[PDB]
Amino acid sequence: KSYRTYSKTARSPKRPFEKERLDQEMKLLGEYGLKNKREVWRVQYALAKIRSAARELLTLEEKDPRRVFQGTALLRRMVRLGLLGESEQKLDYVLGLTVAKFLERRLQTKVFKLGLAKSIHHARVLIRQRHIRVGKHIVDIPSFMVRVDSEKHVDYAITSPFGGGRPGRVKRRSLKGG
Amino acid sequence: AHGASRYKKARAKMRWKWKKKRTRRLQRKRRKMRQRSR
Amino acid sequence: GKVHGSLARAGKVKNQTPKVAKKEKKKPPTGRAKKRQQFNRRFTGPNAQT
Amino acid sequence: GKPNGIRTARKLRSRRRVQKWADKTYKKAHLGTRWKANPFGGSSHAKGIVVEKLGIEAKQPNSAIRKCVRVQLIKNGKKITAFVPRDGSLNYIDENDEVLVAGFGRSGHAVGDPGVRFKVVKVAGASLLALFKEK
Amino acid sequence: ARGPRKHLKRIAAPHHWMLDKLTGHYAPRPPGPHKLRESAPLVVLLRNRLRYALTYREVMMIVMQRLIKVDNKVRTDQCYPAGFMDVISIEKTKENFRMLFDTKGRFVPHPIREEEASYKLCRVKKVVVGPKGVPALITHDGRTMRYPHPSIKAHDCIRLDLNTGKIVDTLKFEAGNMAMVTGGHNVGRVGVIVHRERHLGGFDIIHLRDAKNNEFATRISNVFVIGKGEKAWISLPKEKGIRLSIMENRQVLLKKQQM
RNA sequence: UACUGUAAUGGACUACCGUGGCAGUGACGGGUAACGGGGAAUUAGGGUUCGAUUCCGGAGAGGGAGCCUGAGAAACGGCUACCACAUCUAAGGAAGGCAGCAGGCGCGCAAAUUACCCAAUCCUGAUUCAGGGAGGUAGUGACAAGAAAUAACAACCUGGAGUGAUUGGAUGAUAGGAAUCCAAACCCCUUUCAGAGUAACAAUUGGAGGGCAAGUCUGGUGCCAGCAGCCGCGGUAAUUCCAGCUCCAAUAGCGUAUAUUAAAGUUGUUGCAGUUAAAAAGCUCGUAGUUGGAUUUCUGCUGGAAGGCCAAUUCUAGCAUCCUUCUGGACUUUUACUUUGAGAAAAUUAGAGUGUUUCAAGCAGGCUUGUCGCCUUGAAUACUCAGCAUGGAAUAAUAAGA
RNA sequence: ACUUCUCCUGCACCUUAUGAGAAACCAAAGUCUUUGGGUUCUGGGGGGAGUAUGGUCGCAAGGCUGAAACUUAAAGGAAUU
RNA sequence: GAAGUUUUGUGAACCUUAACACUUAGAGGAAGGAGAAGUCGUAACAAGGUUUCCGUAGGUGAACCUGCGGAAGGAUCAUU
């Protein structure tokens, strides 16, 4: 009845059990500090939208007015998102993307890359416990993905102990208790 | 059905010529019995 | 199959076997913390009995 | 071979609809006999009453007595034999006790060790797994 | 069935109103001078274009002041179909709005001068003889001006006076006369008329040429003569009905948003 | 043919009159667990299956039929009658139609509260004011879609970064305020006094012979009980049963059953196979159907407008004997084919733009001590056989033969 | 009539293939994943079954057309030891 | 302009007969498959001890047998 669209962000692979596949996915969990195999398949699916878009465009012709429009819009996203570097703007380059390029751009890594978090796991806990101001307002969610002008901007939230606020609750219990 | 194979006899079997005849006698009987009940 | 197979022995081995309780042990980590442990102990068969 | 020519739509189209019926799986779908056949009504599950407790023996090589139940579907009062999964549980059924029946997972046909296509999912609504587990 | 439908639904509304998908199950339903899908009701001007009203309630509170006029006449009904080339006049603020087609294919109230807001154009649907053997035009608006010139034929516009009833300035329908499109794919585009094909039976079509030398066609029902070969009786909206390309409309838009 | 009848056209109907009409390209009849379409699921292309259900048509108000009033109904929250159910009766009579909103019985594998309000969205009316189970808000809700807790970090054994309950100090689940939200409650978002050390605030669901990732472990049972989708385990040492321990897979989800799609080049137009595996009529004639040989203004040089790129590629006028009736259309046998163009509702689908905190979404927003605020603000665009139109030299039908 | 040599048209045969095939073998079973010259008929795991019922031809014997319930993990082909 | 009434048309509902469709009982008859082991032969697979098989016909406890014409899928690619 209600006019609300909805979609599925991921889908499971055809083979359940392959030692080639399970090993290479487990590295991506171990590097970037992920909860479960759905978080990989999300990005697996998200790439294949962008990849199948370029695969459709690249078959045609460089002077065709569909490709010059829809290509330049797609390349703007990859430059904005910090996914493809700006030195190469060819549509061909989008194909040479991998899942490691997307997973380095999410906020788990860009905290750690920043280095405030120290360790991949710690960085996820800092995000979820209401620290880390991205731009103007604070962000609670690991799978954010940063737009490259915004990346310098990540900093501890004004509120909170790292930030310069009330020291949570447990430090007060020690301080008032003593 | 069976068509061409009909009598392949790949493995120990009754023998098709005999089998066809046996079924004909069963069938012929079916007729007179079904006409008797008219 | 024959209908008159007897139903006397039904629940032999469930009733036969010796009962034994589960041991109390410290809980495993779950979710992300589980996948941390599985990552490390492989890269630094998996079940090898004596 | 086939007719290739541009105006040969009828011969191509007619040959499929005729020779689709040569498939075994196509006939089980598309004939009218699906609705009369089965004790189920083209349905996933069905309740019924256990008229009798029964035992059947698996065909060789395997030998044993498998412990199944004869049931009458409420909608059609059609008798069927439903296998009881797991150790024992025969005691649990009680003659005249309503039992849910589910497909054996083979689309009728037959399972493993004779002529049984159904499994009793629940007894009195309790379900088999809860009791065997005792949870 | 059984009679006329009193409700219209959102989504089943016209797209060129640009009513949203949520925030209502139904949409306002406009019968008046103009058609359902070639008009826009007076509610969605006030709330969803001009942004005076918030709600459907507040439009009743505006309109029952007798502040809104159209064609120098007070219309009290909130769901009045105010269509192509109608003047709207609010006395408070002292500002007037002539509704034209935007280049994208939307209604927009184009703001105009006080002396210009007297007159308006009406393209004549046909000409026909009434009783006592008197001649009479009929318009797209569904007016019926009577005693014209013999000059005036079908498919051409007349400047009405509005302050008085009578006509003032005619126009003819010929090659080298400015012409806006009111419907179909090429709506909101203005160009000189190159040529028309007859097709003796049904549906005459006209090829015509934009001021950047783009050539495009429409049926004669959609075509609406403004003025002479170059120049125009009326003031035009933003872009003057050029309709620049898809990549151009991208480039101009994102160049704007960076400020 | 001529009435009649209708809002008008009609074998719509009535008189006479003729003997036609449809069909092998499937008429007529039967089945549908059939309302149609916009659409949905399905990871090359081509397809296959579904569409009661948000929008647009259609039909119906227990079954059929009849009718009044009116602009409009063969109306059912209008009436008359029969049939089938059923209510009250003082027994003469009277009244009833939830495939509207809740709710109940019954059928079933299978589905929520006898709740609050017109504040939003629209509609009706004599109408700025009244009304609306249309509609909206809450409750039930693991049908479903999206995000992501169950820990992190230190110092104090294996040494070539991981473990070790050894202590150690550093956010919301919850419970109650505040304001905000709301028609009135409620949830979200903010900020608050309390609020974790086996972080007892304790993650489960299926497996561990093969296919299929993961134990020749240890007890009990002895072709028994049972497992087992298929192959196969069990007859006294079980890598499969019933347990324990350890490990694997997915994870706030996971298993099972039925139907369906891919895998299925196992329905094959793209794209299968037919000597022996399933399958060439025993053999010729033959009507539709399908498919049909070659051949009819080709070459050359001189322009013109564009044109990508450090002259190619398009399109077009002439001249080798090339129409004209006029001032754009008429003729060139006719179509198919291809090209461009018209017109064709949105929602959905792809897609431009935009930090809903991310995201599924949504169609919003963004700048800024300025006040007739500005961005002469955005919400693009594509997509939608047969039919209408048009440029064209091939290909293929088709016509013909002054 | 016979000898030598060329031409088409027959039934075949021998030899060989960087042609094909699962192989046996094959001047067609070749020119087919480098997949489209034209066209007719037939087949879709093994039984049940060329059975049942209905139709139609036949003097009969039987012919042509031709199912389902249930059943089953293999039937079948060519070579090797 | 009421009740009542004349003749038309629209026409529910019920009944008789028939046909078609779909479920369903039935003494007896006669199939197929399943058991899990029985009785009687020995038919096929080797020249399976009468080579095997086809079409058709007749006969016999049962597999089967014999007559006429075919086939090699034969046990022979072969000798004036």
Side-chain angles (χ1 to χ4, degrees), chain A, chain B, chain C, chain D residues 1-116 118-135, chain E:
Chain A
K1 203 207 170 177
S2 54
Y3 301 93
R4 302 284 283 184
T5 316
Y6 55 92
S7 290
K8 307 194 141 167
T9 45
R11 56 182 293 175
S12 58
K14 192 172 163 61
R15 300 270 175 74
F17 310 119
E18 298 180 298
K19 196 164 184 180
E20 70 192 306
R21 196 176 59 75
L22 292 166
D23 194 63
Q24 294 175 311
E25 290 190 315
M26 185 59 71
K27 290 170 185 168
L28 297 168
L29 300 182
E31 282 192 314
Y32 305 119
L34 270 55
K35 188 162 156 55
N36 60 333
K37 298 283 175 80
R38 184 161 162 75
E39 293 196 304
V40 176
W41 301 339
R42 184 161 58 195
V43 175
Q44 204 113 68
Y45 193 79
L47 186 135
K49 290 199 186 297
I50 295 154
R51 204 195 143 72
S52 191
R55 189 167 158 183
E56 177 55 63
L57 296 159
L58 189 59
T59 197
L60 296 164
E61 194 188 305
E62 296 191 310
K63 211 166 278 292
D64 193 75
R66 192 167 163 285
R67 191 182 161 179
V68 73
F69 173 74
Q70 186 62 53
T72 50
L74 187 59
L75 291 158
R76 195 196 159 178
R77 290 171 168 179
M78 298 293 94
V79 173
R80 276 186 66 191
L81 196 63
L83 219 304
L84 189 70
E86 199 164 46
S87 304
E88 49 291 349
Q89 183 144 320
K90 326 310 300 183
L91 77 66
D92 329 34
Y93 282 93
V94 303
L95 295 178
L97 272 45
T98 56
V99 302
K101 301 289 183 200
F102 278 81
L103 266 70
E104 279 188 60
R105 194 49 50 181
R106 75 187 286 178
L107 190 52
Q108 273 185 279
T109 54
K110 296 294 293 188
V111 168
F112 187 45
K113 184 179 179 181
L114 195 55
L116 326 66
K118 81 253 188 171
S119 167
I120 330 159
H121 301 276
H122 188 113
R124 202 200 176 78
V125 176
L126 291 163
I127 295 153
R128 195 73 195 156
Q129 296 176 343
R130 205 81 86 74
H131 300 274
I132 65 140
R133 184 166 51 76
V134 183
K136 193 162 182 168
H137 66 272
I138 72 198
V139 179
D140 206 63
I141 287 166
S143 187
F144 178 79
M145 210 159 284
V146 194
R147 298 172 177 179
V148 106
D149 80 308
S150 193
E151 78 197 330
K152 54 190 58 181
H153 302 309
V154 291
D155 349 359
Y156 284 74
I158 307 166
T159 81
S160 59
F162 316 127
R166 200 180 193 173
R169 65 157 174 283
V170 179
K171 188 63 164 64
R172 291 152 53 192
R173 193 169 62 186
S174 298
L175 189 133
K176 296 185 174 186
Chain B
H2 265 299
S5 66
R6 181 167 74 252
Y7 56 73
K8 182 144 201 152
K9 198 165 199 302
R11 158 281 283 76
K13 278 177 184 177
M14 214 266 165
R15 147 87 132 152
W16 175 254
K17 191 187 268 294
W18 305 152
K19 202 170 187 63
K20 189 179 204 162
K21 176 176 288 295
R22 161 184 301 235
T23 59
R24 295 293 181 86
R25 293 182 181 175
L26 186 55
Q27 282 178 349
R28 204 157 36 180
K29 293 188 180 302
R30 273 166 185 150
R31 294 182 182 175
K32 301 292 184 292
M33 293 299 294
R34 184 177 180 174
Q35 294 177 336
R36 185 179 180 86
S37 182
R38 290 179 181 170
Chain C
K2 294 155 66 175
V3 178
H4 309 290
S6 192
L7 315 180
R9 300 199 291 284
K12 190 170 174 282
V13 168
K14 186 135 278 275
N15 300 357
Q16 195 76 249
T17 46
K19 295 279 278 184
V20 60
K22 198 192 173 168
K23 74 189 284 185
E24 192 168 49
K25 58 185 182 68
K26 70 206 175 181
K27 72 197 170 66
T30 61
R32 192 211 68 257
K34 194 168 175 178
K35 298 286 178 193
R36 189 170 183 179
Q37 293 194 335
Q38 293 185 346
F39 177 61
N40 295 320
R41 72 195 172 180
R42 289 203 200 78
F43 304 125
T44 59
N47 202 344
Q49 301 297 125
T50 55
Chain D
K2 300 156 182 191
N4 279 119
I6 54 134
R7 303 185 175 177
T8 61
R10 268 175 224 292
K11 291 128 58 145
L12 273 39
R13 190 181 190 76
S14 294
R15 281 283 298 284
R16 287 287 140 258
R17 68 172 193 181
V18 173
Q19 300 199 302
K20 271 169 176 179
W21 296 110
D23 284 305
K24 202 164 181 175
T25 56
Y26 191 88
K27 272 179 151 169
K28 289 192 176 168
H30 288 286
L31 294 167
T33 54
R34 187 171 72 176
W35 300 113
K36 178 53 171 163
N38 312 122
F40 288 68
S43 183
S44 51
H45 302 273
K47 281 179 196 171
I49 317 195
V50 185
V51 73
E52 302 193 2
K53 280 192 176 182
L54 163 173
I56 39 194
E57 303 186 34
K59 348 171 214 159
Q60 295 185 2
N62 303 134
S63 70
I65 301 160
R66 291 284 169 212
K67 282 75 160 158
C68 70
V69 176
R70 208 199 227 157
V71 192
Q72 283 192 1
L73 303 189
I74 299 190
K75 350 160 186 179
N76 328 355
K78 288 175 174 180
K79 294 194 173 179
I80 316 166
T81 79
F83 177 78
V84 183
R86 303 218 150 67
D87 189 331
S89 64
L90 268 163
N91 316 350
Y92 296 139
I93 312 304
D94 302 3
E95 302 213 344
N96 260 336
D97 334 352
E98 278 198 9
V99 188
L100 240 209
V101 171
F104 225 145
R106 274 268 273 176
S107 300
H109 194 297
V111 178
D113 209 311
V116 174
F118 314 107
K119 160 185 55 189
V120 176
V121 192
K122 310 185 173 193
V123 173
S127 64
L128 297 191
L129 286 188
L131 314 192
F132 174 81
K133 279 183 180 180
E134 267 211 339
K135 193 296 92 173
Chain E
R2 307 168 59 194
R5 298 182 185 75
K6 305 299 191 190
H7 295 77
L8 169 140
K9 225 151 275 276
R10 267 163 192 269
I11 295 158
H15 195 245
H16 73 270
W17 297 352
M18 312 185 123
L19 300 184
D20 75 314
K21 195 164 63 145
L22 268 70
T23 77
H25 217 272
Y26 304 94
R29 189 174 211 270
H34 298 281
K35 300 186 174 292
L36 197 79
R37 300 190 174 180
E38 293 280 293
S39 189
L42 188 51
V43 302
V44 309
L45 274 82
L46 270 43
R47 68 220 272 276
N48 294 316
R49 291 279 173 284
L50 297 162
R51 301 279 206 285
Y52 292 126
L54 299 165
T55 61
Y56 183 77
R57 177 156 187 75
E58 286 176 46
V59 175
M60 293 198 217
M61 293 162 174
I62 298 159
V63 74
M64 294 281 169
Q65 301 283 100
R66 306 198 165 184
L67 292 165
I68 299 166
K69 300 170 81 185
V70 301
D71 314 315
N72 305 323
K73 265 113 184 172
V74 176
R75 292 283 176 277
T76 56
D77 191 61
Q78 73 202 303
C79 298
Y80 180 77
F84 184 63
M85 287 296 303
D86 293 36
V87 182
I88 296 155
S89 186
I90 320 302
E91 292 180 51
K92 296 181 182 176
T93 73
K94 311 185 283 184
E95 77 203 315
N96 304 320
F97 296 112
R98 188 176 284 173
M99 281 170 287
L100 292 155
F101 278 106
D102 203 282
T103 192
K104 301 291 181 67
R106 305 171 287 193
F107 270 112
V108 65
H110 187 54
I112 51 160
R113 303 288 289 184
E114 73 195 311
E115 193 165 46
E116 199 189 309
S118 298
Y119 74 90
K120 54 155 275 175
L121 285 65
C122 276
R123 199 206 77 172
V124 311
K125 189 170 158 186
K126 59 183 282 178
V127 57
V128 67
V129 190
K132 315 289 177 63
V134 309
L137 286 12
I138 59 174
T139 60
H140 78 107
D141 199 66
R143 296 173 175 284
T144 163
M145 300 295 141
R146 49 175 284 142
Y147 301 124
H149 291 85
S151 314
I152 297 160
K153 228 169 158 182
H155 305 93
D156 54 72
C157 77
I158 305 169
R159 181 203 279 253
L160 297 166
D161 199 70
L162 258 62
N163 292 113
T164 58
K166 298 167 277 289
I167 63 160
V168 179
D169 264 45
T170 58
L171 192 65
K172 291 176 63 50
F173 178 76
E174 278 190 309
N177 286 304
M178 196 82 79
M180 194 166 276
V181 185
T182 61
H185 188 269
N186 296 308
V187 56
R189 281 160 63 91
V190 297
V192 281
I193 304 176
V194 178
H195 189 240
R196 67 192 299 282
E197 299 189 285
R198 293 278 173 176
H199 302 112
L200 296 165
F203 296 107
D204 297 47
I205 58 169
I206 316 157
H207 299 92
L208 49 288
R209 193 185 296 171
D210 202 81
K212 211 161 278 293
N213 309 350
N214 297 307
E215 306 191 313
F216 66 103
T218 37
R219 294 174 167 173
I220 65 170
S221 59
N222 296 318
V223 173
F224 190 103
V225 282
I226 296 159
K228 295 196 82 68
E230 318 306 310
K231 221 229 176 185
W233 292 134
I234 65 159
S235 61
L236 290 167
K238 181 167 72 182
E239 214 188 309
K240 314 190 175 179
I242 293 158
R243 188 149 149 185
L244 55 64
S245 192
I246 294 158
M247 194 168 176
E248 292 285 297
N249 195 60
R250 182 169 144 72
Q251 278 176 27
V252 72
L253 188 132
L254 71 96
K255 185 61 166 61
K256 192 173 68 166
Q257 288 181 318
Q258 71 181 52
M259 309 289 285

